[PDB]
């Protein structure tokens, strides 16, 4: 009994306009009619607008590291017209041993160097020369990755979305998917003003991917959102920290990175929570500040900005890009974890190829990627 618009037909309906839906929709959009349906009034209000904006190859599981490595070519040299300014800025990563665990530090160095030949093993004096506010008594050595980079996440995200629109795709905000049903050979999504139909439903809903499966009657993956908080604060007068690396502790208890002229700090937490519009917890912020004040000479007066976002994982820590088994046309783009920005070019290209029933592109295959390592089928026996 309430009015709705006539249904809109497409080739691929993408639920979510964060980095996952935008990157997949970007690579799909040259080949068919893309409609992206986004709940919020803006596409980057959840995790894609809440990241540390960093590119690190030696981070995550082996699948993650291959996706990240395979994305660099796009980030460094995107197609003409994709964006106005470079997407990456140099920002080496220094992982410091604050707990005196030389065996772990060596393991991470050897692991990282296999992927990144320029990775170096530093002694405590070398680490303190690079970030001179470090307390020498608290430092036992470090790894150093000269190839790390900061990512202009908004430019990247907006570039993917603009690419969709230039290929006649639609990016619809204020279009929460409220109902999902397989009807007459298509997935049909009801939004509050009308419905959308396509043979392929791309589930790119971030921490809400299992909620979308629940609307559709598709068995979920077991995704676990995890809260991570972060904050921005002013450096003390006299500290020029503009060119410091990303600094991370060896056990990921905190990190610290310059952000323009300010400092970004985080307790690097992973507290399991339900999908929601997550806010920072005071204990998170106080913990991150305490650990930075213990590891360095910095004193932190009060933050200028605080926030938290969701990093969402499946059991094995790897990303998911693949059709659901036994649910025709339902494609997962999920479990981006702490890595969705830095893996987005490879994940968007791979996911679009697989949605289209195409082989993965050579350059992705050359990085040690294949369909089965991306598939949700691996989460079951
Ligand atoms: C503190 C922090 C630091 C991080 N550091 C980094 C980093 O340095 N590098 C990196 O690569 N990653 C980092 N990450 C991880 C990165 O933020 C995420 O992996 C990535 O943003 C996930 O993107 P997504 O598109 O899956 O999710 P989201 O950006 O959350 O997008 C999902 C979208 O789905 C929409 N949606 C949900 N339900 C519906 C519905 N019913 N209908 C329509 N739309 C719906 C949501 O509104 C949302 O816009 C960090 C994250 C945090 C929080
Ligand atoms: N770069 C590292 N080796 N470790 C910490 C990365 C932090 C990250 N990208 C996250 O907040 O998801």
UniProtKB/Swiss-Prot annotation:
Pfam family, one: DAO
Temperature dependence comment: Optimum temperature is 37 degrees Celsius.
GO BP annotations, alphabetical order: arginine catabolic process; arginine metabolic process
Family: Belongs to the FAD-dependent glycerol-3-phosphate dehydrogenase family.
Lineage of producing organism: Bacteria, Pseudomonadati, Pseudomonadota, Gammaproteobacteria, Pseudomonadales
Example of a GO cellular component annotation carried by this entry: cytoplasm
Catalytic activity field: D-arginine + A + H2O = 5-guanidino-2-oxopentanoate + AH2 + NH4(+); a D-alpha-amino acid + A + H2O = a 2-oxocarboxylate + AH2 + NH4(+)
Protein name (record): FAD-dependent catabolic D-arginine dehydrogenase DauA
Class in the EC hierarchy, top level: oxidoreductase
PANTHER family the record matches: FAD-DEPENDENT OXIDOREDUCTASE DOMAIN-CONTAINING PROTEIN 1 (PTHR13847:SF287), SARCOSINE DEHYDROGENASE-RELATED (PTHR13847)
């Amino acid at each position: 009994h309430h009015h709705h618009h006539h249904p809109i037909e497409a080739d691929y309906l993408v639920i979510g306009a964060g980095i996952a839906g935008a990157s997949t929709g970007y690579w799909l959009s040259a080949h068919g009619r893309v409609v992206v349906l986004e709940r919020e009034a803006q596409p980057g209000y959840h995790s894609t607008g809440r990241s540390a904006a960093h590119y690190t190859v030696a981070y995550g599981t082996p699948q993650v590291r291959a996706l990240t490595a395979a994305s660099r070519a796009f980030f460094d040299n995107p197609p003409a017209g994709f964006c106005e300014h470079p997407l990456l800025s140099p920002r080496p990563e220094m992982v410091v041993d604050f707990s005196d665990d030389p065996e772990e530090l060596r393991r991470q160095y050897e692991s990282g160097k296999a992927l990144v030949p320029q990775m170096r093993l530093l002694d405590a004096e070398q680490a303190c020369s690079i970030v001179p506010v470090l307390r020498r008594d608290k430092v036992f050595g470090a790894t150093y990755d000269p190839t790390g980079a900061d990512i202009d996440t908004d430019a990247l995200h907006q570039g993917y979305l603009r690419g969709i629109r230039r290929n006649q795709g639609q990016v619809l905000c204020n279009h929460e998917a409220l109902e999902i049903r397989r009807v007459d050979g298509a997935w049909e999504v009801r939004c509050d003003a009308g419905s959308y139909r396509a043979a392929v439903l791309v589930n790119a809903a971030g921490a809400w991917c299992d909620a979308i499966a629940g609307l559709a009657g598709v068995r979920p993956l077991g995704l676990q959102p995890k809260r991570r908080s972060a904050f921005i604060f002013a450096p003390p007068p006299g500290i020029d920290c503009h060119d410091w690396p990303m600094l991370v502790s060896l056990d990921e208890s905190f990190y610290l990175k310059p952000d323009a002229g300010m400092l970004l700090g985080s307790p690097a937490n992973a507290d399991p929570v339900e999908a929601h519009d997550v806010q920072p917890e005071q204990l998170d912020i106080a913990t991150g500040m305490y650990l930075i004040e213990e590891a360095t000479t910095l004193t932190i007066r009060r933050p200028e900005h605080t926030w938290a976002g969701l990093r969402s994982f499946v059991a094995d820590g790897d990303l998911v890009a693949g059709y659901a088994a036994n649910a025709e046309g339902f494609f997962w783009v999920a479990a981006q974890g702490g890595y969705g920005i830095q893996t987005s070019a490879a994940m968007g290209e791979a996911s679009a190829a697989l949605i289209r029933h195409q082989p993965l592109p050579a350059h992705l295959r050359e990085h040690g990627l294949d369909e089965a390592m991306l598939s949700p089928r691996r989460l079951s026996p």
